[PDB]
Amino acid sequence: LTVFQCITMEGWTDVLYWVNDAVGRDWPWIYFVTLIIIGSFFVLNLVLGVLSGEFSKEREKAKARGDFQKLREKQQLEEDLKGYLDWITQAEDIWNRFCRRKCRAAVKSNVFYWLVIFLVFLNTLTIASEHYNQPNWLTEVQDTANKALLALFTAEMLLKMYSLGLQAYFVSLFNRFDCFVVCGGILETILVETKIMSPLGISVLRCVRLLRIFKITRYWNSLSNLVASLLNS
Amino acid sequence: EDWNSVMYDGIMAYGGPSFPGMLVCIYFIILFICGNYILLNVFLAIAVDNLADAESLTSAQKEEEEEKERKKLFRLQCHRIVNDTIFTNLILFFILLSSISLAAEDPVQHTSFRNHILFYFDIVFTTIFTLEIILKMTAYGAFLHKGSFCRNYFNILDLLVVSVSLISFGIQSSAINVVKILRVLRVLRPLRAINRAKGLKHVVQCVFVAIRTIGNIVIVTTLLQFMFACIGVQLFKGKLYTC
Amino acid sequence: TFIKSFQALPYVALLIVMLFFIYAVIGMQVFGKIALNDTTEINRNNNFQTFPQAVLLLFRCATGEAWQDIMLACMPGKKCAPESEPCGSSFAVFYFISFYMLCAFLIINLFVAVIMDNFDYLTRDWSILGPHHLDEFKRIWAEYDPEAKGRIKHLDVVTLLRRIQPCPHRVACKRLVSNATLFALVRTALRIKTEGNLEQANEELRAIIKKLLDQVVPP
Amino acid sequence: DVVPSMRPVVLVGPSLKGYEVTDMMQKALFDFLKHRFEGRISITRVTADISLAKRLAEVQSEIERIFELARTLLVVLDADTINHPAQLSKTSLAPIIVYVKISSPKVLQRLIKSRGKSQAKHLNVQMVAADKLAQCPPELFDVILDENQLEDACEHLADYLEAYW
Amino acid sequence: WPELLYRSIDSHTEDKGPIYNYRVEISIFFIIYIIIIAFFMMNIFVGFVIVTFQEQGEQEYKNCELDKNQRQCVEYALKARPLRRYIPKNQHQYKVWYVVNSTYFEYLMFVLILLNTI
Ligand SMILES: COc1ccc2cc1Oc1ccc(cc1)C[C@H]1c3cc(c(OC)cc3CCN1C)Oc1c(OC)c(OC)cc3c1[C@H](C2)N(C)C=C3
């Protein structure tokens, strides 16, 4: 039992200090130090190896099951719709609606992309600047800053709703996510305005606002495949 | 975490340590051994099978549908560079002995009978390694000759450590608190051996390349961990005090 | 295989050694003069005073054993050592956090490096013939033949120890007809091809794969 | 035979021209051609049949007026009669025919369902036309419209239009 | 962890002392955090290194050649060396040599050592 506790590495040091106080400090460490390295690390390395090695068998076996092939089908499939749905929008515009061309042109423009990124950067400061006893003015700054950022984020969200096809906007997974958070922010304004908030409400309603930080890491594809593969499984 | 505290509470519940009681350890050993085996399978299978598919897309779709979208289509004379072979192993000895020199200094004894003895060993090593600083002048570099010295930053580190030791003696006469930190930075001696050991250079270089690839993962965790901290602050913004 | 692999990757294990030494020295000095006392983590049995003691504390924090409690012990404002003739540091928060991250990462690199360099055995279906089969073939041959006394000397089927895993349908007799024997089984145990030209095709493979004596390879 | 001083440009779309879904796919495409080939390109819109050409009464004058524009010294011809390279193989006017493709037919249903439910049930009448367009080898399959977006798909038309001009 | 968990559960209100098990629902926050970062994300990083190293390892994939089983096997072509056996020549030596080399002797000793530890 005493040996087994050491290998789990909890209480490992306490017994060592109860032995150093009985037979001196010189030799005893070799028993426990070698026990952890030989007992814990190697087996922890072995167990990791076989588990990692074994799953290569199933992963190789799963290749014949076409899990990647089916997954690849959805990825290319759903990607095309967004590309093809662009044509219809680019053609639906050949009551004057020539301004709709201008609004779309900004959506894909670099200036618009970084503008929202900066807004997301500000939103982090609004929330990250919490403090146990904030100055009485800081709460007002966070109060106004939260509201102002909420209007801009929804204001540009609606822009994409009209600039891009309503059905087209919901095609992309990320675009679906943005509606979820921005919709959640609206509840906060109503709940805070009407004084019907609950301790449960503020937590998640705060959490959604933080999730807007995921606006960052959009170009990056390493994480995109993780989530895409993750959702399939 | 406190796997022990729970066990001993369980054992004492069934009397003291004896034969009839004390067998409840079987429940805790079963729980930990069987419990931790499930977590490895569930989370390694999730993190390997799904991860393997994700990178497969990153290398299958990205590689080929971009192959197709692109398939759309001073004195320079009588210098002595000799003796660089024996010094190869010899220098590694001084670094090894120099590191041990600072591994033996006693911190607690301000007026130590040993630090003064060690202080001399720093002199000999400091003087010895300053010789190679002069030697490097003969070789291409010295911020000159197309910056041969600046093209190998690993060799620059050799100078910085020597300069750090040299600076310490100058400020030692002043007997000022500044030297308190300068001494700490001298610990960089062992890394000096990296530039000289061919087999070690590959390992340390391989570590950096890994970090560059990992950058796509650690960056995600930092945002995720920071996201939890932001939630954490709201939940417990100073409610944890206790008289 | 694992013990063998650790030998093939010594320099990686040296890197983790350098991490302990570098951090042990830094901790040895900045937190050298902390006041020892019971009821606190920095006590008679834990302290950055002697190098062996410091490295053990670094090892202690490596396995995550109340390391966070030590981090609070080295924070500034702690009484100083009686030897000193107000004595801690605030570098601890970075010191222990940085060590655990770096130590945890290098151990990960050390663990995975051994796994991958030994990935052949770990992922092996154990159905196709492997090196183990050759070794047990040597032992029976060795028991069937002492030191360097066998060239052909084959007139009996006592070498029947081969089970289903590489006289059913007389294939053994045909295989037997087709170190000399050792190469014979491998070229036919996997059954690379059956076209009446494997030797000619394989005779052109060992030429490019290779070096050593080739007057026994053709057989 | 003899070049009619021009290489008329026509577009079959991914399916029957009788519906709106195919129509929008090209109106945007046509626009970019005339904004980057000022004068070089000309556009013609007709509603009669061209298959019955002898190298119905209205079709008699259809070829000449197309030729009349072709005499002015590309020309884009828009018609609802061509649904397969065979329809234009009956005459040798050196036409250039461009094909819109949906590599996976599964995309069509999502696209068709989006515009309106009235024509959603007509996917069978439409998806079939796409299949008919998936049997012509390169020879009757000259122009390649495979990429989804426009900016990187339209440019694949201009480069093919530099063969002579 | 548990010391903080039970100091967080006993959290009444901002700037106020603790109340025993005021809100045990808060444990969801720690359990969710433990699973996500400590267990899940930590495994992704471990899995990523294993896969990333595999790309480096398979740099010399050489798809043209056949499986790696041949690589070991052909490299084993230099095998089949003499192995020390030294069958006894003296009749007296052979008697003891057979029994000690007997499978019974190997199994018999394993019983003794097991008893020795007992
Ligand atoms: C300083 O280096 C280390 C110090 C301490 C430790 C490991 C160290 O190195 C590693 C080696 C291998 C890996 C990660 C780290 C990878 C390994 C692993 C190991 C691992 C994980 O928990 C977080 C998670 C993972 C992810 C999956 N794969 C399989 O270790 C565990 C436990 O898992 C069995 C555990 O039970 C759940 C409890 C503890 C620990 C560690 C041990 N400590 C901190 C505390 C308790």
Ligand SMILES: [Ca+2]
């Ligand atoms: Ca613990």
Ligand SMILES: [Ca+2]
């Ligand atoms: Ca622990």
